[PDB]
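Need the bound structure for potassium ion, inputs here:
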Amino acid sequence: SVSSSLLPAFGTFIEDDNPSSKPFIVLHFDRRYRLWELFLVILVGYSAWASLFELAFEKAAEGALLTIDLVVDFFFAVDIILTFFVSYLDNTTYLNVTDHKLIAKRYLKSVAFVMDVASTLPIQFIYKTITGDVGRGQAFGFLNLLRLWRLRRVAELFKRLEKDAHFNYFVIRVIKLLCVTIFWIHLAGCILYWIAYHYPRPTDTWIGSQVEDFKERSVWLGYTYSMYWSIVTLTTVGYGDLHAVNSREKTFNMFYMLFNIGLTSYIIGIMTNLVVHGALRTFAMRSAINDILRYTSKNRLPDTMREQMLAHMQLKFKTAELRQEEVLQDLPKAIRSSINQHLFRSIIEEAYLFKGFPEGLLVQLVSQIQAEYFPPKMEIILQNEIPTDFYVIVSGGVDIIASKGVSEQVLAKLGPGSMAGEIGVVFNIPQPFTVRTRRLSQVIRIGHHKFKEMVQSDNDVDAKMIIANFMTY
Amino acid sequence: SVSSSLLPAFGTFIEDDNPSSKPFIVLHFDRRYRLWELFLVILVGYSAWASLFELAFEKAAEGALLTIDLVVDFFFAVDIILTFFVSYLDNTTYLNVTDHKLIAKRYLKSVAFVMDVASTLPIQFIYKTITGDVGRGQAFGFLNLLRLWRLRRVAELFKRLEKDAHFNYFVIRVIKLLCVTIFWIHLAGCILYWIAYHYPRPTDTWIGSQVEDFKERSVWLGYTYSMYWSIVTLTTVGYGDLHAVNSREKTFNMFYMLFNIGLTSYIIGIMTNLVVHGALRTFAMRSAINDILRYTSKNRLPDTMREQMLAHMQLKFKTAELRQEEVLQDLPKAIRSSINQHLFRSIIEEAYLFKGFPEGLLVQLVSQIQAEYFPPKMEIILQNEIPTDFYVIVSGGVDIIASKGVSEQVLAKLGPGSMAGEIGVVFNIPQPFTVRTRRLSQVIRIGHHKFKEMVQSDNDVDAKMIIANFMTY
Amino acid sequence: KLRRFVVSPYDHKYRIWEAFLVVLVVYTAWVSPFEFGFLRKPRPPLSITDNIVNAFFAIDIIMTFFVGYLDKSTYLIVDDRKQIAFKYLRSWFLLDLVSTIPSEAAMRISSQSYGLFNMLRLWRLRRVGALFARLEKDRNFNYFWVRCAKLVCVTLFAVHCAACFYYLIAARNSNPAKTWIGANVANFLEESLWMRYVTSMYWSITTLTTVGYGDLHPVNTKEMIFDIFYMLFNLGLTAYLIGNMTNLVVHGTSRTRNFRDTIQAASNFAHRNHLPPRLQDQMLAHLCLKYRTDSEGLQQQETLDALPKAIRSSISHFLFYSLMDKVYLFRGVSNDLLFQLVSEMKAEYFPPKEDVILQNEAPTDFYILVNGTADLVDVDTGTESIVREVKAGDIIGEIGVLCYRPQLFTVRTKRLCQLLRMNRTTFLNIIQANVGDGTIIMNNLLQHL
Amino acid sequence: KLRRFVVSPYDHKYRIWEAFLVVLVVYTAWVSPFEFGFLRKPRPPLSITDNIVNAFFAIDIIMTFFVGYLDKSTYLIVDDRKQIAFKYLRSWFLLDLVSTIPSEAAMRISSQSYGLFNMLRLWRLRRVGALFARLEKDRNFNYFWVRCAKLVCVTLFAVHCAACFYYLIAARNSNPAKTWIGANVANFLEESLWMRYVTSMYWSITTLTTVGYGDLHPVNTKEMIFDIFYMLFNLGLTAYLIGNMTNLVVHGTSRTRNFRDTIQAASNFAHRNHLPPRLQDQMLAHLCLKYRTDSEGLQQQETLDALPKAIRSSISHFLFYSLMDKVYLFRGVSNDLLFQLVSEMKAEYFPPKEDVILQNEAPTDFYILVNGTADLVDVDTGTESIVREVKAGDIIGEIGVLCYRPQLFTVRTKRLCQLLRMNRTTFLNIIQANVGDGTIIMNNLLQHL
Ligand SMILES: [K+]
Ligand SMILES: [K+]
Ligand SMILES: [K+]
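Answer from helper R.:
Posting the output first, comments after.
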């Protein structure tokens, strides 16, 4: 059940059925493994924050943030010795390759392995004992920026969630914008503080103009000032209390609010697309109800006619809906035929005309049946019409109408599993009735010059008895 | 030609044909009258500015703005003695009513007359001689706000331009936003200056904080300051150099930028709708072409096949375009039939089968013909098909195909005005050919069981000779 | 229906009482935030008004044991006391009970809670969401002015709610000289309670609309942290407003963009086929007239024609039976023949001076006027010899169709008319089926004399 | 083609020179405004670089008498000298001649004109509009990455152009102590020419993006009037940007919104009809495989099938004739029989472990493999007795279709395979028409031994 198994985003229970499960192999679509991946992804959310934070502030890397980077760099070090025991799926074969000597050299040959070992290095911690102090300076801090390689795991989740239909497409596409826009607030507020901290004159800065002793206060005062500046700039409020002072800050600042144009145009373009498609069907069922009431109001029609027109249009849109679930036309003929031989095998096996029939011709009939639905009072066959098709009703009802020039009299009522329109087809006469539905019906059509050729030219078994079955009817 | 005459926005030339032109009457759709209306509308653009300006500034009403209000209040006083000589059009009869005693009492009974005389009063000028001075004070200036009743004439033009197809819908839709958004900048900058000018303490204002002597400087210094504040607030820049100081200014100011939310959301919602509909067509043509190249690239197809597929899809979209100009189906049968008897009368009069035919039946045929178009190599009639319809070609070409099981041989070439598919219809046999187009063709269909009933049951004149014409063919 | 002395879900007095309960809920949306941020103990002007509102909501919660309800699994109107009572006590009983407690009685329990206690009175704000769902699934209310009035209420409630939180951060400070408000007006604790509110609303609106002048900004870090979450919330809130305002503009300019898309097609069509300067004007006249005619509910066939033939036969019968019966031809024909004669008959409109029937034409149809008028002009060597004029409720073209001879008089409208059209073939069929045609031709020759 | 010693519109060296004259226009779009706002007389570093650019554009304007052109009324490539010369001298001859004049030579005509003279060098900016029209009607270039880049270029040019006008208003003032820049840094006339530009660009972007901190605002009325028209222009300019960014997001998330709209339908469909837990997984597997198979150009039938049968018969012949010819059955059949056998044959894909042909089934079709592999497993009392496996370019199902007996071995894929399917009826028709079926059945019985 492999493609079925790999289409849920969060992964699926793997039991003792052992269809692909070999020893000493973890299947990549296993539940447990995908929960572990979600764990590592919520640790990536911490490592994205803590790595930019220690670049900018640099007095954080002494406290309780250096034994949290060591615990988190452990769960990412066991995910490198465990990617040699994980299946993968070819995009040229689609076979679930689970041979060790073939997993163990597509990881190696990839950039992923060298980047995962260049990210999980506790550089700041090994520097803390082989030397005396913590790393310090302008360029030393550009070393925990290697742990922004783990953002590729968050790029994964928000890609295997936008395909799982079990998850709302509005929720996840909005959480994606949240996560992206507040990582960039944080990224940009740490770069401007980094620029102010390392500037020669500590009072011609954006923050040294306001807090003269900003380098000696807490790190969570500089952090809150920087996040405040970043958000009054991103949102475009711009009080102007904190602003760029020197030309290093003016330059980054005006590259910051140039990308902000794109970012906030993108957020808007996405929020005005998840609101415009969340109202594309209801604003069509309201477009066709609105003129019903307009027509029933402009004229003084009774309200019963308005309870009839509305109910019928509701029943019409129900058909137009459930007839777009017709997905089964591009699939290969084998799977489509195996599905049809489950839906409509006992309907076409017993219809008073396919009674004494070869199995081959029954299969040749069932493999081609495209079923259609009809609202409750449409006429599918007008009287004196050219006999082009005939129908078989799988569920619902139809009535047989015989117009007397001036009348329409219901001659009989047909239910599930009985042919409607066969007389003019078998006789090649204008269809001497009018079959119009009565309930919401599903009918399967058997066109003319497709059934006739198939029963006439091809097979040599059925003969002389279907006419006896038609004269019996 | 009355509805035709009244559908041009700027009116049309009225000549000596005198179809509705009676003496001592100006027709409202005349071009001279609509040019005069455009004149009054460009004077309304001045009166919208000059009336708000004199409310707020009040030292303007002494200079050259009081003999410009008298010249402009003259051209609006002759448009009241000239609305008694102007036609009008009922919306219950559509007759162009041009009787004086009926024009002269739908103007009177309307609000328009009393408002047009309450707007054209030179109140500030009559006040200037029956008294000694110009009007002055908080409440006296609320008297040239009556001339904002003339904005209804600008509301007209931008309503009779959004229906004329001779005018771009992007230009005029965008212009209506310009005119509306810069009238409101001007309206709001004159109200905040009006609030500051009449405030008790002249230095706890928004402008008295900056220019202490603001009441004694030029009016075009206060005007430029007010327009500057108004536009840095509307656009939401908000430098904050000029801002509200007291609670009368804070209150209007925060009602101003609450309506600004709606106004700028509306401007955006309109500019993102004249850009999203200015691209639907191009996206469909580019959506279609993009896969062709994708298919011709993924496989290594020759470029000649790509010059064939593309040319055919272009010819297909040309048909899908020029077949949506089929407007002639809701019009009454009389006008539709009079149009058809001009397009397709000599095609159906001479088609080797409608040769000896009653005029009544020819009209009965021509009144119903719905013409269709076809791309250059589609098959309209497959061989051994049920004879449901037959065609008549008004322009283009078709070929006659006779498949030999394994071949397709072009038996003959048919051009304009020759029936395609008639054999199986007249004989009621499966259509013993395959008519597929060769050029972009237009064909008119004559269905079966519609032509047969009409030639058989109804008329008693045509008989015995159409069979002689068919055996002649 | 109901037991003696009890109440129903749709009853009028109940909807009227409930709308007055919504205005009281919009007065506690303004007051509950303001007593939390701006006041500390019950002052006279509101200590009595809020007790009035409390008494009204107590009356309401005690009247909810005598009110019907409607299942969403059965759709039966359940009106048994021992069952609505339990469904009330299911979820909203003590939640609606704490929301109406005289705050003077919560003061004796404890101080420090007044502003925070009367903050859960915002529980009785579910009624506004109820009303806004009902009004926008209802179809008697314009969906534009019903949704666009919800984005005004939740934007005015965020602006007001954030203006009382941001002032309470400043009023609860120590040394109110480094605050956001205590930095512009140093003596802000002795100021008119209306000036404080005005300057808090001013900051709220500038910040919410992203103008951000720069006066009145955060000063502490407690206010910066509040402002980081308010501007985060505002960014999300305005994005959604701009989205909702496009969903209400592209769906608002449809019925006009579809018209100039038709007069354009009707000009390309007349351009390709080289129609003379007498048919293009007629086509454009009939296409215009259609917009005015079908701007109203007088004309609708794009969707009304997608109905069954048993529904479109009741409508066209109800609209035109009284008219069809008062025609001299069909005097006493039958009961059903009139029904099926009026069932298949297509109604059409005609601009003024637009002759529907030309003289010497082939007698295809005959029309029955519904409203308007016209005159039977005949073209001779001496033209324009207008003979008579018909009125509403009369039949034209009848002599050329029931005898199959070219039409003898040309009828030309002089007013927007509405006729009913019937082909010759259709009529001849439906009357050929029957016997009553003798009466028809007898009425005809009776009319002839 | 061409005369001896002459040049053509599409020739490779001409397009390479003409894209080199665009990076010299991007150079002048930056330098022209900067020498207008920030400089007064030619300084060394640019007085020579702009003369270099001038020499290059003179070379170009003198090479345009030897370049073909294309009529839009004939579409013939006109390459006669006495006719391209006049079309050049029609409009763009002296306009492109003044745009390359050494400014040191315009100084001797008059001072005061340097900055204003080199401002019409922005005439040679039509080339960027030409390039941006060509690249976006071209189809080898991603429209999203080309329409969007043009928007970025115009904004960078408005920001830069307004930063040099707004500085020139301040540099041309008297008493440069009440200006916008002379109010923050009083001694701004002796500052690094890069600091002046940085602080002007800073004001530009702050104002254009509507942040507007408040440092660097207008001070005079001459600057207020400039700023009223710059913020007006910007109001319109950002509105079209937001419009263009939605036109490029809703058209960018289509091919994914259409997929979860299919797996949803394939679940409602299996839910209504109660498919057992063996067909729903198969349907979903085949629908998934379609997204991977169609994301590439391997599978396309939504629109490729709307082609004529004479176009879709050349494609399917070119793709599969070499394959169809190397099948043991059709050894030496004919020249056309193979053509029409490969013309009506539908290609399909199959996921791994997905048996296309079950044993004991009714012999409906037969398939020809194109790529992938599979194995002929047979189900017996002792199951899973795999007997052989086929490769690419072989035919399966042939013995049950050419003799009409139930299939004997079940073929199950072991890789994502692509087969060609042919019905029994179609094949029997096209071979029944001909005589070469003797060779077919002879190859069959030859294979059997
Ligand atoms: K701002
Ligand atoms: K600001
Ligand atoms: K802003």
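Comments: Strands of chain A lie at 88-89, 96-97, 371-374, 379-381, 391-395, 398-402, 409-414, 419-420, 434-437, 441-445. The pocket of potassium ion (ligand 3) is lined by residues A 236; B 236; C 210; D 210 (CB under 6 Å).
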